[PDB]
Design a protein around this nucleic acid. Structure first.
Ligand SMILES: [Mg+2]
Ligand SMILES: [Zn+2]
Ligand SMILES: [Zn+2]
Lengths: 1338, 98, 83
RNA sequence: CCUGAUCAGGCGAUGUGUGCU
DNA sequence: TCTGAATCTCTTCCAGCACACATCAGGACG
DNA sequence: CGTCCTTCGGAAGAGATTCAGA
C-alpha cells in the first residue's frame, strides 16, 4: 500500500491540521455520571463519542442518524475507534523550548546558533538576557546580560537596543537568521584556516546547514507554540476495584501543563508584574520539559511515592517501550505452554501433546468441522458441544490433527534449531512428550524445563513448517557440517554393552547361519549376548553405477554385533559394527549412512538405533554400587612418599638453605607428580582388572566395571571425573587465583574432613558465579551481532569478479592446529589453482570445492588457495551466491534468497555460554625437515654461525614434501646454527638468543673511535663493588646536563689505518648511535668482530575478548606503527614525550610522531622501516591494521583471533560467519578527493553509495573519487545506517530520532527489521520471491 | 496453559499475559530471529500480524477458519499506529509516503 | 504420509519455490477448484500437494498453462452468451 | 474478543520480592 | 598571543519466562 | 459532598581546561 516512511519537524500549521479541537480545562470526568467534561482531556466534542454510535446527551442511537453532529452537545456520531485516532492541541501563551533539541548532546540549537549550551540554558530559564539585533552599539549579537548589565546597557543605550529573555529571544534569533549568508561565510572560513578543531566544528556546522536548507524546514520550528496531546484511548483511565479511577502518568503531566498555562493566561489578562510573569513562564517551561522527556531535568517529578513519572520518551525507549516490547516481540493467540517429559516410543517427526491442550488450541477447527458435517447448526450449538464434550468431538479432533504441524519452542532460543515442527500425537496427561534425539539440539534436559507450542493457522504456514522446519530436515547444523542427531546416553550405553566381547561365555565358537538365528539364540537363552561366534553375513556393496552388489561370507564376530546388523540398511559395509561402538563410532556410523544412502534411510535408521539402544540398555541392567569404585592399594604408599618428600624439603628450608618461592614450586611439582602416579595406578587397576579362565590358564581382558563402561562408552563423564571418584582430587584453587600447597588427598568414596571440603567450596562458588553472569553477557552479545547483521540477504547469483583472500593451513609454532582441508572446504576459488609441477589448470576458477577436490589438493600438496571470501565481494546491497559458498545445512550451493546474517550471528553468539570469564630463550624444533628463512638480512660471523641484522625474521620448517609445518619468530641479533636450506635433526636447537639484552651487533670491523662521548654529560664511569663492573656507562635521556643536551654519541668503525669505512652500498660510515641505558663494553682503540655487541640495552581471554574484537576497542597500551616508510631518527629532547622523525627515500617527508616515554622502542636509528612495522611492542590495533596494511589483513587478524578463542574452548565455527560479520563491520568509508563527484571532502558515506557513485563516472569521461575505508564497531556500525527504524530499535532512541528529525531522513524499507516492524513480508526466501515480483512491478 | 482466542488488551490490541488472566504466550525477539533464520516469511507474518494484532484481519481470520478457507489478509499492526501517534504527539512529524 | 520432502526438493530445485507452488496448488484444492491427480489416503490437501510434486506432474509452468486454459474457457463460454 | 439472557457486563501501569531456565 | 594533545564531566545497559503483593491526588475551604 | 490547591561499574561521545612554541 505504501513505500518509504518520511520524518520531519512539526510545523504549527501541521499541528493545527492534525488537531480537531482546543483543550482548555484540566478536569477529565464528572465522577457521578462518568461522562466527561465539556472539553477537558477526555472529551466528546473533540475526540469522539464514548460508545458505539451513541450521542452524549442521549439523542441519536442509530445508524440512520449517522453523521450529523448534535445540536445540544456536539457529538459527531461515529465509532468509538475514532477516539483512538483524533488528536488535540494546546495553544501555549508563551513559546517554549523543545527539550530534545536542547540537551541531546550534541545540542542542535547549541551548534546552530554557535553558542555555549550553558548560556542557552541561562537564556531559556529566565535568569539572563541576550541581545537580538543590537545595531551600531557597544554590544555584540551574542552577548549575554544580567539584570544590572541590562540596566547599564539601557542607561548608556536608551535609544534603539534590544535584549530579551526566555524562549522569545531564542525564537527571535532563529527567525532573524538567513541560512545562505551563514553557508557562504562558513565555506569561506573553511577555505581560510588551517586549524583542525576549527575544521571539525565548521564541518559539523556546514553539514547541518546544507542538510537543513535541502530540507524545507525552518529553525524556528524547533520552538513549540502549539503543543499536541495524545488521543485518550492511548492514555486510558482504568477503573480500579474501589471508588476512584487509576490513571496513567500522562494525565497528571498534561493536567499540570494545562493548569500552568491557564494561570499564565490569567496573569497576562490581569496585567501582572514582571517578576511574577517571569516565575510563571519559567514554571511553564519546566512543565513542558517535564512532559516531553522526564529525567533530563534535575529532580524528576514524582506521582505519589519514591518513583519518577513515565513520560512520552519513556514510552518509546528502553527494554519496555514500544520498539523492544510491543512491536518486535508480540504476544500471540492460538498458543500454549507446559512442562515436558520423554516418551521414547515416538518417531522423530512427531511429538506428544495433551488432549486438553489440543482441544483448547483447535477450537475454531473443531467448530468448522462440526458445522460442516451437520452435527450442529450454529456457533452456540458448537460451543455447547465442545464444552459438554460429547463423544463425537474426539473423532473430529483425531481428524483435524492428522497432518497439521505445530511449532515447539524452548524459552532461551539461542540458535535456529530452537523452533521446530512436529506432527501431534494425543496423550492423556498434562505434559508435552518430546522425542529424545531432539533434546540435545534443544539443549534441554528433563529437570523441569517448560516448552511452548504454537499453531500455524493458514495454509502457507503449514507448508513452510513442513518443507523448512520439520524435524527430519534439520539434521545438519548451520555452524558446521556435523550431525545434530547424536545419540546421547542410554542408547550409547546400551550399544556399548551390546557390541563387546568377553573371553568366554555361553555358546563359544559355534557357527551360525545368519543374524536371525543369532537373535533366536539370544532370546531363548542358549547363548550369551557378547560371546564370539563365526556367522554367515551378507552385505551389499554398491560398487556398480548405482546398482547394489550382494556378497556374502563368514565373519568372526560376536552375537551382539549380528543382532545389531539386523538394523543397518543395505549400503553400509560390515566393518562399521565389528568394533566396540562407543559414542564417536556411532556418530560416524550415522555420518557415513547420511553420506552414502541419503536422507530417509538415515532417519529411519536413527529411529531403529534409539529403539534397540533403549531395549538392550534395559536388558543390561548397568547399575552402580559402592563396590564398583576400586581404590588402589598403591595410593597409601604414594601419599606417604609425597609427605616424606615435603618433609625433606621443609627440613631444608628450616635452616636457611632455600627461599620461599623455591620451596613452594618444589612442593607443587612433587604433588603434581604424585597426583599423576595415583591417576595412572587407578586407571590401570580399572582397565585390566578382570582375569578369567578360558580353557585352564587365566587371561586378562577389558573389564565390565559399571563406572568403567559408563566412562569408556562416552555416555557420562571423562577420565577426570572418575579420577575424582577414585584417586586424589588434585589441588583446588583459591579466590586470589593462586593454588594451595596442601592438596586434597581424599576422594569421594572415602570421607572428607572440614577443611578439604571448604577448599573445594571455593572453586564451586567461583564456577557458579561465572555461569550466572555469563548468561547475560551471551545474550547481549547475540543481540548486538544480529542487529549489526540482517541487512544482508543472498540476492544475486554471481558478482563476476576475481578478488579474494589467500587461505593457508594455520601454524602457531606448536603442532599444526587447523589444516587446509577444514578451511578450504566448500568455497569457490578465485584464481584457478596452479599445479606445482608445471603450469596446469588443476581446478577451474569457478568450481565449488567439495570433498573430492579437497582430497585432490591433498594429493598434489597445494598450500594456498586464493578463495572468494565475502569481504571482497562486489555486490550492491548484498552478497552474491558464488562468494558465499556451501550452505552447510544442505548439500548444494546457497540459494538466491536465504538470509545469512542472522544464521551467521546466531552461530557466532550461540557458543557464548561455553566461554570462560575470569621465557624467550631459544628455538627447539620438533620434527626433522628443512629450513626456510623469511625476510632476513644476515651475515656470517667469524665463529661460523649466522647472525641477523633484520628485525622480523621468520623461520619456517619445510618438510620433505614442500610444505611448511612449523614456524617461529627470531628477534633482532640472534645466533643461527643453520643457513639457507640446510638439514636439521629431530629436537635440535637451531636458533638461540638472549631474553634480556637487545643486542647492538655490528657488520664491519677494524678500529673503533668514540665521537661525542663526554665523561660528565653523556657517559660516566660506573664501577661496582670490589670491581663487580669496570666499564663506561652511557647516561639516559632526560637526566643529562643541558650543556650536553643536544649531543648524541656515535661509535665509528674505521679501518686499520684510521680511514673511514663506509656502509657497503652508500657513502655514510658504519657508525652506531647509542640510545639511553647503554654500557660501553668494547673500548677505544679495539679491533672488533662481526656481529659484536657494543652496548647492553635491557628492558585476558574469554567472552570479553570476543567483545573487544567485534567492538574494536583499542587496547590500553597500543602498539605504535610506522605510518610511512623511510629512515628513523630522534628530535625533541623528551619534554614529557620524545619526538620521532621518519623520512622516505624518493618521496616527500611531511611525517612526525611523538612517542610516549614509557614505551620501549624495538628500533635503532639504522632500521629503515617499511609501513606495517612495529616501533614499540604491545597488542596490535585494528584501526592501524586497516589504515596501514589492508582489508584482507584486518579480516585475517579478526578471524584468527576469534577462532583462537572459540577453538581453545573446543567449539567448531566455520569462517563464513566471522567474515560476514567483518563485512558488516567495515561498511562505512570516508572521502579523500572529491574530483568530479557530489560529496564534500571531509565527509563520511557508506561504501555502496560511493561505489555506485563513481561507477557511472568511470564508464563515462570524468574523474572519480577516492575512498578511505573506516572500520567501525558493531555498536557504531548499527547506529550509522541508511535507516532509522533499525537504529531506533537498537540502543539509544533519542539521538537517533533527533538526528532523523533535523535531517528529514526518509527511511526506505527492504531490511528485515524495517519490515518486521511495519508488518509485511520479510525479503527472505518466500517473501524475497514476492519482493522480486514487486520490484519488477515498479 | 492454552489459549485459542480470549480477551484482548486495551492500550495496544494484543493478547494478555498470564494464566489467571486468560492470556497467550510471548513470541519473543529471539524467536523472531529464529524464524528469520529459516526462510519462513508467511509464518512470521501471521505470527506478528494476524494472530496478535490487526483487529480487522483477525476477525476475518476467525470467520475464514470457521468457514473452512485457510486464508489470511495482511492489514497492518495496530500497535504500529500507536507508535505513530506517540511520535506524532511530540514535535516530530511522521507520515507514510505513497 | 510425507515425513520427508526430499523428492519434491529435487523436482523443484530451490527449497523456496516449493512452498509457493504447493500453496497455490492447495488453495486450488481446498476452495474448490479441482480434484487431485493422485488417489488420496484420506489425507489433507497439503500432503496431497507435496505428494503430487513427488509424483512429478505439477510445477509453476503447468499451473500457469492450466490456469490459462481454464481462463480461456470462461471466455469461450462467454462468446455463446453474446450470441 | 470473552462470560451470562433479538440483549446485558467485562479490557491497566508501576515498582518490590520470590522461584525456575 | 593561540592552538592541538592530554584532562575533566553528562548518558546507558546489563538474558528470557512464570508467580505474589502494594499502590493508585489527598486536605480542606466552600 | 463540590470544587479545588499545591554515596560501590565500563566505555565511547561531546563539551571545558592546561600547554608549550612561535
Ligand atoms: Mg533445564
Ligand atoms: Zn445529542
Ligand atoms: Zn560476489
Amino acid at each position: 500500500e505504501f513505500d518509504a516512511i518520511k520524518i520531519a519537524l512539526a510545523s504549527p500549521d501541521m499541528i493545527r491540521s492534525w488537531s480537531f479541537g482546543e483543550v482548555k480545562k484540566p478536569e477529565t470526568i464528572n465522577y457521578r455520571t462518568f461522562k466527561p467534561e465539556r472539553d477537558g482531556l477526555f472529551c466528546a466534542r473533540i475526540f469522539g463519542p464514548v460508545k458505539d454510535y451513541e450521542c452524549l446527551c442521549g439523542k441519536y442511537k442509530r445508524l440512520k442518524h449517522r453523521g450529523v453532529i448534535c445540536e445540544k452537545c456536539g457529538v459527531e456520531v461515529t465509532q468509538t475507534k475514532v477516539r483512538r485516532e483524533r488528536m488535540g492541541h494546546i495553544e501555549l501563551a508563551s513559546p517554549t523550548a523543545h527539550i530534545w533539541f536542547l540537551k541531546s548532546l550534541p545540542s542542535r540549537i547549541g551548534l546552530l546558533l554557535d553558542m555555549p549550551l550553558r548560556d542557552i540554558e541561562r537564556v531559556l530559564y529566565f535568569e539572563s538576557y541576550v541581545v537580538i539585533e543590537g545595531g551600531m552599539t557597544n554590544l555584540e549579537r551574542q552577548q549575554i546580560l544580567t539584570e544590572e548589565q541590562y540596566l547599564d546597557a539601557l542607561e548608556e543605550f536608551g535609544d534603539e537596543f534590544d535584549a530579551k529573555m526566555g524562549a522569545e529571544a531564542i525564537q527571535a534569533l532563529l527567525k532573524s537568521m538567513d541560512l545562505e549568508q551563514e553557508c557562504e561565510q562558513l565555506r569561506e572560513e573553511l577555505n581560510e584556516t588551517n586549524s583542525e578543531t576549527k575544521r571539525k566544528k565548521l564541518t559539523k556546522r556546514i553539514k547541518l546547514l546544507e542538510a537543513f536548507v535541502q530540507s524545507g524546514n525552518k529553525p524556528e520550528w524547533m520552538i513549540l507554540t502549539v503543543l499536541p496531546v495524545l488521543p485518550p484511548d492511548l492514555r486510558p483511565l482504568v477503573p480500579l476495584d474501589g471508588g476512584r479511577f487509576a490513571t496513567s502518568d500522562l494525565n497528571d503531566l498534561y493536567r499540570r501543563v494545562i493548569n500552568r498555562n491557564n494561570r499564565l493566561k490569567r496573569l497576562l489578562d490581569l496585567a501582572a508584574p514582571d517578576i511574577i510573569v517571569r516565575n510563571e513562564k519559567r514554571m511553564l517551561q519546566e512543565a513542558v520539559d517535564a512532559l516531553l522527556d522526564n529525567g533530563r531535568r534535575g529532580r524528576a517529578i514524582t506521582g505519589s511515592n519514591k518513583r519518577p513519572l513515565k513520560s512520552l520518551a519513556d514510552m518509546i525507549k528502553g527494554k519496555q517501550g514500544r520498539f523492544r516490547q510491543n512491536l518486535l516481540g508480540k504476544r500471540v493467540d492460538y498458543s500454549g505452554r507446559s512442562v515436558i517429559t520423554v516418551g521414547p516410543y515416538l518417531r522423530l517427526h512427531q511429538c506428544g501433546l495433551p488432549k486438553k491442550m489440543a482441544l483448547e488450541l483447535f477450537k475454531p477447527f473443531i467448530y468448522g468441522k462440526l458445522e460442516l458435517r451437520g452435527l450442529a447448526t450454529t456457533i452456540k450449538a458448537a460451543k455447547k458441544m465442545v464444552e459438554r464434550e460429547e463423544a463425537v468431538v474426539w473423532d473430529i479432533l483425531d481428524e483435524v490433527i492428522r497432518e497439521h504441524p505445530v511449532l515447539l519452542n524452548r524459552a532461551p532460543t539461542l540458535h535456529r534449531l530452537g523452533i521446530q515442527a512436529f506432527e501431534p500425537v494425543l496423550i492423556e496427561g498434562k505434559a508435552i512428550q518430546l522425542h529424545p534425539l531432539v533434546c540435545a539440539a534443544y539443549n534441554a534436559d528433563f529437570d523441569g524445563d517448560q516448552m511452548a507450542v504454537h499453531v500455524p493457522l493458514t495454509l502457507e504456514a503449514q507448508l513452510e513448517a513442513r518443507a523448512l522446519m520439520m524435524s527430519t530436515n534439520n539434521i545438519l547444523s548451520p555452524a558446521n557440517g556435523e550431525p545434530i542427531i547424536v545419540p546421547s546416553q542410554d542408547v550409547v550405553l546400551g550399544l556399548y554393552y551390546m557390541t563387546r566381547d568377553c573371553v568366554n561365555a555361553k555358546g563359544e565358537g559355534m557357527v551360525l547361519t545368519g543374524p536371525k538365528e543369532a537373535e533366536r539364540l539370544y532370546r531363548s537363552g542358549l547363548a550369551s549376548l557378547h560371546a564370539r561366534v563365526k556367522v554367515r553375513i551378507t552385505e551389499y556393496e554398491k560398487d556398480a553405477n548405482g546398482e547394489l552388489v550382494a556378497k556374502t561370507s563368514l565373519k568372526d564376530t560376536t552375537v551382539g554385533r549380528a543382532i545389531l546388523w539386523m538394523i543397518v540398511p543395505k549400503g553400509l559395509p560390515y566393518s562399521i559394527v565389528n568394533q566396540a561402538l562407543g559414542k564417536k563410532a556411532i556418530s560416524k556410523m550415522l555420518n557415513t549412512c547420511y553420506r552414502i544412502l541419503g536422507l530417509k534411510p538415515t532417519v529411519i535408521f536413527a529411529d531403529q538405533i534409539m529403539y534397540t539402544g533403549f531395549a538392550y540398555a534395559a536388558r543390561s541392567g548397568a547399575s552402580v554400587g559402592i563396590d564398583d569404585m576400586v581404590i588402589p592399594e598403591k595410593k597409601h604408599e604414594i601419599i606417604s612418599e609425597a609427605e616424606a618428600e615435603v618433609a625433606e624439603i621443609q627440613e631444608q628450608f628450616q635452616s636457611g638453605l632455600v627461599t620461599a618461592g623455591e620451596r613452594y614450586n618444589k612442593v607443587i611439582d612433587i604433588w603434581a607428580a604424585a597426583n599423576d602416579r595415583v591417576s595412572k595406578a587407578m586407571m590401570d587397576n580399572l582397565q585390566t582388572e578382570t582375569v578369567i579362565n578360558r580353557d585352564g590358564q587365566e587371561e586378562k581382558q577389558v573389564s565390565f566395571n559399571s563406572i568403567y563402561m559408563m566412562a569408556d562408552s562416552g555416555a557420562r563423564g571423562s577420565a577426570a571425573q572418575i579420577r575424582q571418584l577414585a584417586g586424589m582430587r588434585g589441588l583446588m584453587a583459591k579466590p586470589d587465583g593462586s593454588i594451595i600447597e596442601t592438596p586434597i588427598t581424599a576422594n569421594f568414596r572415602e570421607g572428607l574432613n572440614v577443611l578439604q571440603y571448604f577448599i573445594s567450596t571455593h572453586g564451586a562458588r567461583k564456577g557458579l558465579a561465572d555461569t550466572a553472569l555469563k548468561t547475560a553477557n551471551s545474550g547481549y552479545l547475540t543481540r548486538r551481532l544480529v542487529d549489526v547483521a540482517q541487512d544482508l540477504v543472498v540476492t544475486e547469483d554471481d558478482c563476476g569478479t576475481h578478488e579474494g583472500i589467500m587461505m593457508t593451513p594455520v601454524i602457531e609454532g606448536g603442532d599444526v592446529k587447523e589444516p587446509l582441508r577444514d578451511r578450504v572446504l566448500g568455497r569457490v576459488t578465485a584464481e584457478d589453482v596452479l599445479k606445482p609441477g608445471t603450469a596446469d589448470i588443476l581446478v577451474p576458477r569457478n568450481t565449488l570445492l567439495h570433498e573430492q577436490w579437497c582430497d585432490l589438493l591433498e594429493e598434489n600438496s597445494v598450500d594456498a588457495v586464493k578463495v572468494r571470501s565475502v569481504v571482497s565481494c562486489d555486490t550492491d546491497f548484498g552478497v552474491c551466491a558464488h562468494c558465499y559458498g556451501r550452505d552447510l545445512a544442505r548439500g548444494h550451493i546457497i540459494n538466491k534468497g536465504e538470509a545469512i546474517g542472522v544464521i551467521a550471528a546466531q552461530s557466532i553468539g550461540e557458543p557464548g555460554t561455553q566461554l570462560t570469564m575470569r621465557a624467550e630463550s631459544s628455538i627447539q624444533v620438533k620434527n626433522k625437515g628443512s629450513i626456510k628463512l623469511s625476510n632476513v638480512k644476515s651475515v656470517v660471523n667469524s665463529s661460523g654461525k649466522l647472525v641477523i641484522t633484520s628485525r622480523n625474521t621468520e623461520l619456517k620448517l619445510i618438510d620433505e614434501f614442500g610444505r611448511t609445518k612449523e614456524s617461529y619468530k627470531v628477534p633482532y641479533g640472534a645466533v643461527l646454527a643453520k643457513g639457507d636450506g640446510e638439514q636439521v635433526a629431530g629436537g635440535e636447537t637451531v636458533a638461540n638468543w638472549d631474553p634480556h639484552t637487545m643486542p647492538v651487533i655490528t657488520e664491519v670491523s677494524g678500529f673503533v673511535r668514540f665521537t661525542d662521548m663526554i665523561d660528565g654529560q653523556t657517559i660516566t664511569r660506573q664501577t661496582d663493588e670490589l670491581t663487580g663492573l669496570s666499564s663506561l656507562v652511557v647516561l639516559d635521556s632526560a637526566e643529562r646536563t643541558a650543556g650536553g643536551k643536544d649531543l648524541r654519541p656515535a661509535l665509528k668503525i674505521v679501518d686499520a689505518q684510521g680511514n673511514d669505512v663506509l656502509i657497503p652500498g652508500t657513502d655514510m660510515p658504519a657508525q652506531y648511535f647509542l640510545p639511553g641505558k647503554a654500557i660501553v663494553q668494547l673500548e677505544d682503540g679495539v679491533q672488533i668482530s662481526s656481529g659484536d655487541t657494543l652496548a647492553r640495552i635491557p628492558q585476558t581471554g574469554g567472552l570479553p575478548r570476543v567483545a573487544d574484537l567485534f567492538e574494536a576497542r583499542r587496547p590500553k597500551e597500543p602498539a605504535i606503527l610506522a605510518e610511512i616508510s623511510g629512515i628513523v631518527s630522534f628530535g625533541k629532547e623528551t619534554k614529557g614525550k620524545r619526538r620521532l622523525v621518519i623520512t622516505p627515500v624518493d618521496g616527500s617527508d611531511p611525517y612526525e610522531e611523538m612517542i610516549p616515554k614509557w614505551r620501549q622502542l624495538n628500533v635503532f636509528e639504522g632500521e629503515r622501516v617499511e609501513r606495517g612495522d612495529v616501533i614499540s611492542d604491545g597488542p596490535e590495533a585494528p584501526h592501524d591494521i586497516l589504515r596501514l596494511r589492508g582489508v584482507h589483513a584486518v579480516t585475517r587478524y579478526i578471524v584468527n583471533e576469534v577462532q583462537d578463542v572459540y577453538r581453545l574452548q573446543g567449539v567448531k565455527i566455520n569462517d563464513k560467519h566471522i567474515e560476514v560479520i567483518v563485512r558488516q563491520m567495515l561498511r562505512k568509508a570516508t572521502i579523500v578527493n572529491a574530483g568530479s563527484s557530489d560529496f564534500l571532502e571531509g565527509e563520511q558515506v557508506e561504501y555502496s553509495r560511493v561505489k555506485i557513485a563513481n561507477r557511472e563516472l568511470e564508464a563515462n569521461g570524468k574523474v572519480g573519487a577516492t575512498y578511505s575505508r573506516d572500520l567501525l564497531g558493531i555498536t557504531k556500525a548499527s547506529l550509522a545506517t541508511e535507516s532509522f527504524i533499525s537504529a531506533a530499535s537498537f540502543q539509544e532512541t533519542t539521538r537517533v530520532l533527533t538526528e532523523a528529525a533535523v535531517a528529514g531522513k526518509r527511511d526506505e524499507l527492504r531490511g528485515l527489521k524495517e519490515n518486521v516492524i511495519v508488518g509485511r513480508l520479510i525479503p527472505a526466501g518466500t517473501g524475497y520471491a514476492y519482493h522480486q515480483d514487486r520490484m519488477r512491478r515498479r | 496453559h492454552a489459549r485459542s482466542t480470549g480477551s484482548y488488551s486495551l492500550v495496544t490490541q494484543q493478547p494478555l499475559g498470564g494464566k489467571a488472566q486468560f492470556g497467550g504466550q510471548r513470541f519473543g525477539e529471539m524467536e523472531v530471529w529464529a524464524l528469520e533464520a529459516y526462510g519462513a516469511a508467511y509464518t512470521l507474518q501471521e505470527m506478528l500480524t494476524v494472530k496478535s494484532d490487526d483487529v480487522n484481519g483477525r476477525t476475518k481470520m476467525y470467520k475464514n477458519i470457521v468457514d473452512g478457507n485457510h486464508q489470511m489478509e495482511p492489514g497492518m499492526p495496530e500497535s504500529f499506529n500507536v507508535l505513530l501517534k506517540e511520535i506524532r504527539s511530540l514535535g516530530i512529524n511522521i507520515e507514510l509516503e505513497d | 504420509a510425507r515425513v520427508t520432502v526430499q523428492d519434491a526438493v529435487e523436482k523443484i530445485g530451490n527449497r523456496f519455490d516449493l512452498v509457493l507452488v504447493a500453496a497455490r496448488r492447495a488453495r486450488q484444492m481446498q476452495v474448490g477448484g479441482k480434484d487431485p491427480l493422485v488417489p488420496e489416503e484420506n489425507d489433507k490437501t497439503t500432503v496431497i500437494a507435496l505428494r503430487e510434486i513427488e509424483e512429478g506432474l505439477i510445477n509453476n509452468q503447468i499451473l500457469d498453462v492450466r490456469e490459462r486454459q481454464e481462463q480461456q474457457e470462461q471466455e469461450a463460454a462467454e462468446l455463446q452468451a453474446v450470441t
